[PDB]
Symmetry: C2
Subunit: 497 residues, 2 copies
């Protein structure tokens, strides 16, 4: 920091409620401000739209050295810096940045941090230099020149419990959030669609608007609509929050196998006599934490640890259970390969961070134990790594895409995957849970049940030509090695939540 060099500080006064701290900008590396110095009614040539960049810790630019000529000077700052400021300042009026604000062109494309930030105009009023004996600073207070729309759609936290009301352990709240969300300006049309900023942490949408604007914003979500009347609520530097149908709420639910699972992540009791078919994407088929490093923590030699647990790494919040798709089709899995996915995998740098898809040649578990483990999510990630290398369009990827297209998985889940042979075998028990707990629900929300006499694909590999395939009796599932990749068997997809 140059001797006699003026230090720059920038503070956002924040966007406050039209009716707390409000929305205060903290700034980030790369943000730029412009600085002006006005002396005796004229901008100083040396400090005329001078840019300063935030590096994550402080504001840097060309040093401004203190001089006695800076006594009585009015300093002004604005964000975001504009290369062209000709005619954007006013020396006569009482608002130096009045033309910048008047001509500020705001669009409805604000869906990412950069698209929003570049439109969030902030300015200071006349600021004095503080200091003496070579230690000087400029500390600006910035105010937002636009207005802000905040939308809070309805959401539901589920506290999943056992039959005694004891909450199951989790990493973060499980929240069902609105789906098929679209916002429109004044009327619903493809050309009037607007793109607000989605705050995933607060679960709310934000949109900068010109002060005194009066448009209706139409929101579509789930299967309904709302009208957000912004007229008279668009004050400069202030926000209006629209809470739609109660906003956030919390419920408790005894999570059980057979419960109905929906596109927004909501769950309905499997005892429901008339379940809604709309947006139903599957049935809860297993309750508990399905991470292999949790399930198999006490297995001899600890073959599953946090280091090689892809599910724990990619979706640490999915500790409640598994869902089976209403989706079902018959088809091929992949072409017959020269080199198995297992054999390819063992030649890569991924052997410490993933588990092989093989049920048969695993280095840590024998061919009796490995096909019984819950590893479908792992297997999907290993198959994605294989795809990234060879770009072979396996038929299983097309069925996965089709399941996702017809029954979109919630963003809070793993997404759909072909279950491992272990996950499929666990669908059946000695009390015929497949027919009694699953098919009795499937028939209420779908025209297809899980045929107990059918053969099901797993994502567990036998060799270069075969997958493990699962069959059932009325008392057990059985993982067999005869699943020739080019044969036709039945698909059911799973997701973790």
């Amino acid at each position: 920091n140059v001797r006699n060099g003026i230090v720059l500080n920038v503070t956002d006064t924040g966007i406050i409620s039209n009716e707390d701290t409000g929305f205060v900008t903290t700034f980030t590396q790369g943000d730029q401000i412009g600085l002006f110095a006005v002396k005796d009614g004229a901008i100083l040539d040396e400090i005329n739209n001078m840019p300063f960049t935030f590096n994550g810790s402080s504001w840097s630019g060309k040093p401004i050295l203190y001089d006695d000529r800076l006594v009585g000077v009015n300093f002004y700052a604005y964000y975001p810096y504009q290369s062209e400021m000709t005619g954007k300042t006013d020396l006569i009026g009482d608002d130096f940045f009045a033309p910048l604000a008047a001509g500020w062109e705001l669009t409805t494309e604000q869906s990412d941090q950069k698209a929003y930030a570049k439109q969030d105009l902030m300015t200071s009023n006349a600021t004095a230099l503080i200091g003496e004996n070579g230690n000087y600073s400029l500390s600006f207070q910035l105010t937002h020149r636009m207005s802000l729309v905040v939308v809070k759609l309805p959401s539901t936290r589920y506290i999943f419990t056992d039959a005694e009301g004891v909450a199951m352990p989790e990493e973060t709240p499980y929240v069902a959030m609105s789906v098929d969300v679209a916002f429109y300006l004044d009327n619903v049309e493809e050309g009037t669609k607007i793109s607000p900023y989605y705050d995933a942490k607060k679960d709310e949408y934000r949109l900068l608007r010109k002060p005194s604007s009066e448009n209706q914003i139409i929101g579509h979500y789930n299967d309904k609509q709302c009208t957000l009347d912004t007229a008279e609520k668009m004050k400069e530097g202030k926000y209006k929050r629209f809470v739609v149908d109660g906003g956030y709420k919390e419920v408790t639910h005894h999570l059980q196998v057979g419960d109905y699972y929906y596109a927004d992540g909501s769950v309905v009791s499997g005892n429901e006599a008339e379940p809604a078919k709309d947006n139903c994407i599957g049935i809860v088929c297993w309750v508990g934490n399905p991470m292999p490093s949790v399930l198999y923590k006490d297995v001899a030699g600890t073959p599953y640890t946090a280091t090689n647990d892809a599910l724990l790494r990619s979706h640490p919040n999915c500790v409640h259970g598994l869902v089976m798709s209403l989706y079902t089709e018959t088809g091929k899995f992949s072409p017959a390969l020269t080199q198995s996915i297992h054999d390819w995998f063992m030649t890569t740098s991924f052997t410490s961070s993933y588990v092989s898809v093989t049920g048969y040649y695993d280095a840590n578990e024998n061919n009796k134990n490995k096909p019984l483990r819950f590893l479908g999510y792992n297997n999907s990630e290993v198959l994605d790594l294989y795809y990234d290398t060879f770009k072979t369009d396996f038929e299983c990827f097309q069925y996965q895409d089709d399941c996702e297209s017809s029954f979109p998985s919630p963003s809070i889940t793993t997404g759909w995957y072909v279950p491992s042979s272990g996950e499929l075998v666990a669908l059946q028990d000695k009390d015929n849970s497949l027919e009694s707990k699953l098919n009795t629900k499937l028939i209420k929300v779908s025209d297809k049940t899980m045929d107990i006499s059918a053969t099901y694909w797993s994502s567990t590999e036998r060799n270069n030509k075969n997958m493990y395939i699962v069959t059932y009796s009325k008392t057990a599932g059985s993982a067999g090695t005869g699943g020739v990749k080019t044969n036709t068997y039945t698909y059911r997809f799973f997701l973790g939540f």
Copy 2:
């Protein structure tokens, strides 16, 4: 109230904690006290163990008229009045009732209000007459001379909920209380068994003991034991409360068909992998309020009202559901009758307060609707009224006794009864709930399941010779009229809770 007649008031100072108000006696109609008047070191012949009886509002006896001779007189009172008080008072010592207390014989037979009250010795100290100008009163403060043991065994309130944790409506708390309760003095033997007073309102046992007594009291309950060391805790006019294994506690439970039901009224989730067989008496087979005036409140002509609802009248707290017995046997129901129970019933004064047992000749409901109603509890009470009149030992009463002997029903339930044909038909649905929800539980706690091909007795009468009998397919129950009372069919008992 006689002019110049002294008014008597009696107040118990109460039994207080050895370590609130404590246990304060309020007195009841028929209670008697004895009164003494001591003048110049001698008992007055006119007021020597004079009895006074409480009538529910006031104390009455032979009137005591005020006289100047009563100035300076010491009055004493004790409870309960004894016809013989010779040598039971002390004029020399500072405690007038010291010999009464010293010779007081206390037994361990205190199981009813009268057996307890007759042993609860209470006395006053010297009391002065209050008043002037013909208005006088004697207001005694009585203190308990014995000590008191209070035992609080463990109990569990169940707040039964649906899958969303919403409490089901109820009239009073549902509480599982200890069973097979027995107390013994010093050691366990048939001859050392003691009978304390059971306070059903507070769910606790009380036993008067001599002050400074030191016996261990051994309590047996459920399948365990406790030792109550009374040594050093038996102070005159004070109680010691022993809280066994935490005493009263509250839990919440999602009540479902298939849940395991126990002898103490406790319920275990039907999802339990290893249910306890010990004290299991049945399976929850229906959830909800089973009172016919509630279930059928909207039926045309309102055939079921509070006036003719025997279940609501006798067990108003049984609004949670029904349980089916683990018990099952085959046998006859009754002899063939000349006059049906229905035909007998219609000639009685009970036709407005009960529903007929007939499924076929009901005056308000036709023969298609009447056999589908839940009326087994009603039917048991009508059959008891028939037994009270004719004293015929029907075989169904012997099977009921046998079920109760092997699987005792909790005191908070209806007790076991033969289900109506309507209750049996509701055990099966289109998703084969009989085999999937009931038999899968029965096989874990019993060696017998409900055979879907068997024929079951109901308590619904067809005519003088036949009962309705229920058969099942994999999709429905069917109530048939071919149940000749002297034929052999299968019994399953139900209870309401």
